[PDB]
Amino acid sequence: RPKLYVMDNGRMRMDKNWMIAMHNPATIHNPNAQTEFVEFPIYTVLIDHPEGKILFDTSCNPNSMGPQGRWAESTQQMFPWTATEECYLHNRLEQLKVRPEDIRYVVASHLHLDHAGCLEMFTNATIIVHEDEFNGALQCYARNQKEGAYIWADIDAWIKNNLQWRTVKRHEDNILLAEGVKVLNFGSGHAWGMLGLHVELPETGGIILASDAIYTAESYGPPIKPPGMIYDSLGYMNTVERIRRIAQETKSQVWFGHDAEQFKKFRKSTEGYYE
Amino acid sequence: ARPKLYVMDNGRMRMDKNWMIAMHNPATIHNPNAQTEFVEFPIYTVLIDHPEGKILFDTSCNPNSMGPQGRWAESTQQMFPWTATEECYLHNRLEQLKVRPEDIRYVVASHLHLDHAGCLEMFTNATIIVHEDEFNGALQCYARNQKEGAYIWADIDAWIKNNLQWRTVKRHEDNILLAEGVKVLNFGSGHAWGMLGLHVELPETGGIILASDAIYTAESYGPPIKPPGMIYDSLGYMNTVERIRRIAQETKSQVWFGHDAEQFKKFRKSTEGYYE
Ligand SMILES: [Co+2]
Ligand SMILES: [Co+2]
Ligand SMILES: [Fe+3]
Ligand SMILES: [Fe+3]
């Protein structure tokens, strides 16, 4: 039945303390400990499903970087994004002969700059997002916050393009989107409200798309190593452990948000698909 | 009641500023290998000489914490070194006030971190007041034979061997009137598993809130609030800081932070006097 494509949406760099909290602490014999600017991949997933095409995440906006870019300069220097034209999401979809108007459902894991970048392309889709994440992002917009992980100009475009929203409620059960495709309601942790995805493929079997609920394999452990970028510490831990249980009980792979080694291994959209 | 409140200097500690102020100086494209700093801060305790009986808030570090024969693990000693002359040790500070450990009726343990619960074992004639969630969490560290981290196995060992008398504050228990104008504040989860504070109403000085590690420094307090890297419950921490800010406003109280160097310098310490 379905076909699942991994699309390469370029690379981002940032302080590795964001990724792994207190990774290299200062000591009496190393009092001025230095950090490192680590590279990690930005990616999206397309599930070409009989019942309709499902897109997980949307990467960054093409108009994000540069002196005429949407991102504030402080954001550009703290979380720089590098991508060729081939990396842009509209192009990756074009090379698969898929038009934006063909996307039935977009699942926004959360509304950070590197996942919600291109929501505005999908004017014929239902956009699925946690309600707490939505509220949080809209407050950023209304309070006219121009820095941080929530891009004012992105949100501005969502409203102008008249996107059709479907909020997952705080205490809402998981949503069966299609045969073998479930939206997981992870709630608060990394951000205000996280969504994941469990995909059951005939040949490949079970896949959990965790997004920023688990950055990397180092995050996952055990033991768990939580990030510096975090809203609800307790929630974050509960979520990781919950994914570990689901993985075991359903014999599923766990696909992390930004794991460089794992990403290299993936079969990309320019080479083929999973089935 | 006409009490006297004393601030006692129990030495200094140093650690990565990222523990104290999370992501205080993040790396950027043009400064990729940004360095941190190793900041110094005070360790102190408060004595309330009250007519109904003497109350002690926190107990600093154990005299035999540091060194090759030290209770603290080497890794701990290197990340959180404590420097203190003999006169800084709690038992000496009390002596210089003609106070013996057996004179202490109540010990309020803000939490059970290495720099607050170090000297509980001295007070075998007191009721030790502690948050039940903090007490439980420390005991698990003990039972699991965890020898590294902020909860000192040898300290806990001694509390047990010395048969301390405990009184746990329950998770949803209200504030506890310990004496005229002395209330134990139940802050719950945040920096650690279970935080306690103290509100003190002095005739002359007025209101005082002892926050301990619920609020590290003035930099923590803001506004805006700047949370620590050393954090268990992030939401609870934020909730607690705003709660303290409210109480402070409504009761016209000063807020004494856990480890503010500037504020500590301005305090009248036990070698100079007290607060009435
Ligand atoms: Co994110
Ligand atoms: Co502490
Ligand atoms: Fe991300
Ligand atoms: Fe402390």
Author numbering:
A (entry chain A): 9 to 283
B (entry chain C): 8 to 283
Report text from the authors:
We report here the kinetic characterization of several variants, including Ala157Gly, Ala157Ser, Gly156Pro and Ile237Met. While some of these variants show only modest changes in lactonase activity compared to the wild-type for several AHL substrates (e.g., Ile237Met), they show altered kinetics for specific substrates, resulting in changes in substrate preference. To gain some molecular insights into the effects of these substitutions on the active site configuration, structures were solved for both Gly156Pro and Ile237Met variants. On the other hand, the Ile237Met variant shows a slightly altered conformation of the Pro234-Asp240 loop, in the vicinity of the amide group of the AHL substrate. This conformational change is more distant from the atoms of a long acyl chain AHL substrate, and this is, therefore, consistent with the minimal changes in catalytic properties recorded for this variant. Following this, when considering the locations of the amino acid substitutions performed in the variants studied here, two of them (Tyr223Phe and Asp122Asn) are part of the first hydrophobic subsite where the lactone ring is accommodated, Ile237Met is located at the second hydrophobic subsite, and the rest (Gly156Pro, Ala157Gly and Ala157Ser) are located in the third hydrophilic subsite.
